[PDB]
Structure 1
Amino acid sequence: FPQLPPAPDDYPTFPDTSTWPVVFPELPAAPYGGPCRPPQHTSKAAAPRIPADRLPNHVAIVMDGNGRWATQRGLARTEGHKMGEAVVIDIACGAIELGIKWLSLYAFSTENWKRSPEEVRFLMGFNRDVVRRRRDTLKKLGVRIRWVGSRPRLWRSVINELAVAEEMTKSNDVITINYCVNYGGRTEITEATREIAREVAAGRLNPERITESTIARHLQRPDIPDVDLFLRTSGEQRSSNFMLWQAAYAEYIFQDKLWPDYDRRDLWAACEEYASRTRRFGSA
């Protein structure tokens, strides 16, 4: 089984949401060694034994309910998103422990521009900072992260920090994260159709030998496999333009828990649900 073994009782925990930004624990040194073990949850729960063959290769997660988490408390929408950064990194430490290879996170879509300039301006600058703050934590843990999304109208500063983050981690392989910012499904499929029309213009491609693979090879990030499990948080039941191509044959699981009330044990609950189930016909 691929799960790391339950952290020693005395290993640092995460998150300590008394401070903010939550402080990521100084972890023990390695012998060494290479990738550090991720701190254990504050509850010290341990990953569930699941064969590598019953696991989702690729968990896509639609974070949901930060704005609404704040609002039931008399707070500004945007403060909930701040309790979200800790849950992100938590779930990340959970997937590593669990033995998960690909994790997609829907930070911001091509449709979140509809919201107020006050919230759009907060999210843009909070993704920028988050990235810079976490690049070295994520790096050390075995994570390979990079920006997945569309370029039109996206704060340049977000594209930069993540290409810094891509350069540091383009050789890590404990797990891969696709940090989706200004991501739209149709927009990404649109981006590739001209990746294609462009080659056809360079007569470097036959328009009658075009396959689903041909399209899949011209998406922004072409090594992103199909999405096995589609977590969507806070009771909402929709994909919302997330991994449209990739998540076609995805199995859906909708948790009713607001994202900031979320933690890695929740990720493990769902994944178990997925693995323990009898794979039906045609079902991978």
Structure 2
Amino acid sequence: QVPAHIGIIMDGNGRWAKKRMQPRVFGHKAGMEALQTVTKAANKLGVKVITVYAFSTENWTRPDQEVKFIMNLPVEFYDNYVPELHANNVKIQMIGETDRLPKQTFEALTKAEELTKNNTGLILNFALNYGGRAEITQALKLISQDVLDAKINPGDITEELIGNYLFTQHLPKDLRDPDLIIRTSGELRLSNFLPWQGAYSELYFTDTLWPDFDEAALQEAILAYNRRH
């Protein structure tokens, strides 16, 4: 009675900070608290995957001081969240052009992956330096190279093959596509998040800002989802 894979666009961190007379960066720290709550609660509820839109390709255009702060969050606050998620049997993974992340950020995410790699509970999947069209492009580029290198023929080119070349290929086969996509902070649009995988997803929009998105809010999103069927 729960969606197996939930995609989340965690909007409203800056707006939340602003409403509280705090610098925008504080909102992103508060967003980590909300994700911790949602990840733990979704794991208890039976959700298999959460893919979060943690950092888009367009987020690099934000002020340098803001990007640096955001990139430092898994580095500085690793001990505050990761051991607890691991104790909760949560598996941490990432998708995106993650090689372009600062050395320390990549190291912090890799350390968290390696720690939780044997965990059998919910997969918390971070979309980092991620863009949907860029993901499809790199898949379509690789398939072309494989075709040119005779590893596959052009008759092998199918929707199923494309799915195996997307960043989501490492998720179990039946769990690659989100059943539900949640978007907070009232924006009614996808912003290049999982365009291929989310082509049939149910969509849930809330005016609730991401740092305020808790267990009760996730239970509402799940309740609405089950009412769609």
After TM superposition, the score normalised by the length of structure 1 is: 0.75
Contact 1:107 1:181 (8 Å CA) reproduced: yes
Query: Which residue is 1:5 aligned to?
Result: none
What is the count of residue pairs matched by the alignment?
A: 225
Select 2:8's aligned residue among 48, 61, 73: 61
1:201 and 1:129 mapped to 2: Cα distance?
A: 44
2:16 and 2:69 mapped to 1: Cα distance?
A: 16
Please tell me whether residue 276 in structure 1 is matched to residue 223 in structure 2.
no
Instruction: Report the 3-state secondary structure (helix = DSSP H, G, I; strand = E; otherwise coil) of the residue aligned with 2:57.
Output: coil
Query: Which residue is 1:251 aligned to?
Result: 202
Percent identity (aligned): 42
1:274, CA displacement in angstroms?
Answer: 0.6
2:194 and 2:75 mapped to 1: Cα distance?
A: 22
Which runs of no fewer than 5 residues in structure 2 stay unpaired? none
1:242, CA displacement in angstroms?
Answer: 1.0
Runs of 4+ in 1 over 4 A off after TM superposition: none
Identify the range of structure 1 (154-163 vs 246-255) with the bigger mean alpha-carbon deviation: 154-163
Amino acid at match of 2:211: P
Query: Which residue is 2:81 aligned to?
Result: 134
2:54 and 2:76 mapped to 1: Cα distance?
A: 13
Higher relative contact order (CA 8 A, sep 6+): 2
1:235 and 1:262 mapped to 2: Cα distance?
A: 12
Question: RMSD value over aligned CA atoms?
Answer: 1.6
Contact 1:94 1:268 (8 Å CA) reproduced: no
Contact 2:56 2:130 (8 Å CA) reproduced: yes
1:60 and 1:263 mapped to 2: Cα distance?
A: 15
Deviations 1:74-114 (A, max 9, x none): 22111111111111100011101211111111111111012
1:65, CA displacement in angstroms?
Answer: 0.6
Which runs of no fewer than 5 residues in structure 1 stay unpaired? 1-50, 280-284
Which structure shows the higher helix fraction?
A: 2
Contact 1:185 1:241 (8 Å CA) reproduced: yes
Instruction: Report the 3-state secondary structure (helix = DSSP H, G, I; strand = E; otherwise coil) of the residue aligned with 2:166.
Output: coil
Structural mapping, 1:21-32, within 5 Å: none
2:76 and 2:126 mapped to 1: Cα distance?
A: 13
Query: Which residue is 1:23 aligned to?
Result: none
Contact 1:145 1:169 (8 Å CA) reproduced: yes
After TM superposition, the score normalised by the length of structure 2 is: 0.92
Query: Which residue is 1:232 aligned to?
Result: 183
